[PDB]
């Protein structure tokens, strides 16, 4: 493939031309961090970002998969996505009536939020957190799981980033989700709370006020041994 020619095709107003080039960029960006760097180096990101405004949903879906894959790279690669201006459009796409488009935007955000504290901070400043908390009440379990993974990533930052998650009203939903019949939802809720519990005394005290302790205690004896250890370890961080 010629990456420069792919990137120039994104100057097209022709919607069939735009969809074929987006598909190729996305596939290349799936091939690991040197491939991601080639896509970045060719000047792909400005056009990928502008295209998140395409009223055409198939063009939108492809652009999101490309951006999502780039954001699976290292912290400098994530930062290039941020620098290109992806976040506002990504947050707006959390309100998409199309659940597939929602999932993809949520995945891209989750990947940006899996970077360092500066990448997490960009996600917070862009206004993702209230949307992610809302999405914890989604009827769609895939949406719920992806929203929990993004929150858990944000809550892996510094104490101020944790406190942003607390301030967005995450804790009641998270404590509630420790009662999910779905073990993956439970494990993700548990991970999120465990990350919040690694903050300062104020953060730990908020987790205790939300009633996490009673439920984490119960979970030390869950049938799943990985959940037992996760709960035993969250409790240790709170009791600390």
């Amino acid at each position: 493939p010629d990456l420069p020619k792919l990137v120039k095709l994104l100057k097209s107003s022709n919607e069939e031309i735009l969809l074929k080039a987006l598909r190729a960029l996305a596939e290349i960006a799936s091939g690991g961090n040197e491939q991601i760097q080639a896509v970045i180096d060719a000047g792909a990101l400005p056009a990928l970002v502008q295209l998140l405004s395409s009223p055409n949903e198939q063009i939108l879906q492809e652009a999101l998969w490309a951006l999502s894959n780039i954001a699976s790279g290292g912290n400098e690669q994530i930062q290039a996505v941020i620098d290109a201006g992806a976040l506002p459009a990504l947050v707006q796409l959390l309100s998409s009536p199309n659940e597939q488009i929602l999932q993809e935007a949520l995945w891209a955000l989750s990947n940006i939020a899996s970077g360092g504290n500066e990448q997490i901070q960009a996600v917070i400043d862009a206004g993702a957190l209230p949307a992610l908390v809302q999405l914890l009440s989604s009827p769609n379990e895939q949406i719920l799981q992806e929203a929990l993974w993004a929150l858990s990533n944000i809550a892996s930052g510094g104490n101020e980033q944790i406190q942003a998650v607390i301030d967005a009203g995450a804790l009641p939903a998270l404590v509630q989700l420790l009662s999910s019949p779905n073990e993956q939802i439970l494990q993700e809720a548990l991970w999120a709370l465990s990350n919040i519990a690694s903050g300062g005394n104020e953060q730990k005290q908020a987790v205790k006020e939300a009633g996490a302790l009673e439920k984490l205690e119960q979970l030390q004896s869950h049938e799943n041994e990985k959940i037992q250890k996760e709960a035993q370890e969250a409790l240790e961080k709170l009791q600390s």
């Binding site: 930062q79 941020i82 620098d83 201006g85 500066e118 990448q119 901070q121 960009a122 400043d125 101020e160």
Partner: protein
């Protein structure tokens, strides 16, 4: 990205600029306003073939390497592209060197002409800081 006032103030405070070299956070926010209008991608070409980059308009002759400026010293040991990021770390780290270069914030021409001597704490009043 175009920062908001308090958004940039909080970012600069988290990065250690509040009362760095005795310059209150309002000085740095004011300097950014008048240098870049809070635009991280701002660039200014100078007649001497250098360019000023980013939120604090850091010059390519003395401080950062853009690979196109004659007589360049790259004293911040940083590519000028890093100074256009929304992650302000590199512009802040370079600013801390600049401000220490013997002239305080007089290194920033727009600071000297628009901010110096003013009520610069107005730029941070209202912020959660």
């Amino acid at each position: 990205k175009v920062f908001g006032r308090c958004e940039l103030a909080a970012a600069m405070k988290r990065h250690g600029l509040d009362n760095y070299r005795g310059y209150s956070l309002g000085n740095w926010v004011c300097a950014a306003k008048f240098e870049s209008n809070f635009n991280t991608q701002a660039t200014n070409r100078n007649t001497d073939g250098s360019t000023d980059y980013g939120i604090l308009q850091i010059n390519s002759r003395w401080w950062c390497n853009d690979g196109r400026t004659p007589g360049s010293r790259n004293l911040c040991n940083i590519p000028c592209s890093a100074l256009l990021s929304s992650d302000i770390t590199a512009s802040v780290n370079c600013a801390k060197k600049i401000v220490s270069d013997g002239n305080g914030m007089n290194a920033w021409v727009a600071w000297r002409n628009r901010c110096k001597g003013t009520d610069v704490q107005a730029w941070i009043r209202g912020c959660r800081l």
